[PDB]
Amino acid sequence: WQSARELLRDWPSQRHLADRVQPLRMRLSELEQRLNNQQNAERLLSEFCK
Amino acid sequence: LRQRHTELEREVSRFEDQTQQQRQQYAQAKESLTTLNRLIPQVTLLLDET
């Protein structure tokens, strides 16, 4: 009884949160460019300082 | 020598003018370049018109 209640507790949450996957895809892709460009500019500045 | 003065003055006037315009154009060149420097490096990529 208790376990099943916990399962059906999660189930609403499960679908609701899984809906967000695709937004998260674009989010992660977009932040990747932050990573990449930060690294690139780090190059550039180090090369200049040299 | 006064005729020399007038002719040298003509030439110097020409150079003064040529400089006066020229510098406008090339200052504007570096200015537009600054505009690009502001825009492209990352802004064109996050303002990628999503």
**Which chain B residue has its CA at the smallest distance from A41's CA?**
B41
- Distance from B36 to chain A by nearest Cα, in Å? 17
- The angstrom resolution of this structure is 13.0
Q: Rounded distance, CA B37 to CA B29, Å?
A: 12
The tokens for A37 are 């460009």
Where do we find the tokens 């020409």? B14
Q: Establish if A37 touches chain B: CB-CB under 8 angstroms.
A: yes
Residues 6+ apart with CB under 8 A from A37: B42, B45
- A36 and B CB contact within 8 Å: no
Structure solved via: cryo-EM
Chain A residues with beta carbon closer than 8 angstroms to that of B46: 30, 33
For residue A16, the one-letter residue type is H
Distant-in-sequence, close-in-space partners of B45: CB < 8 Å, separation ≥ 6: A33, A37
A33 neighbors B45 (Cβ within 8 angstroms): yes
B42: closest CA among A6, A27, A25, A34? A34
Can you state the percent helix, strand and coil of chain B, rounding each to 5?
85, 0, 15
* Cβ–Cβ under 8 Å, residues A37 and B42: yes
- From chain B, the residues in CB contact with A33 under 8 A are 45-46
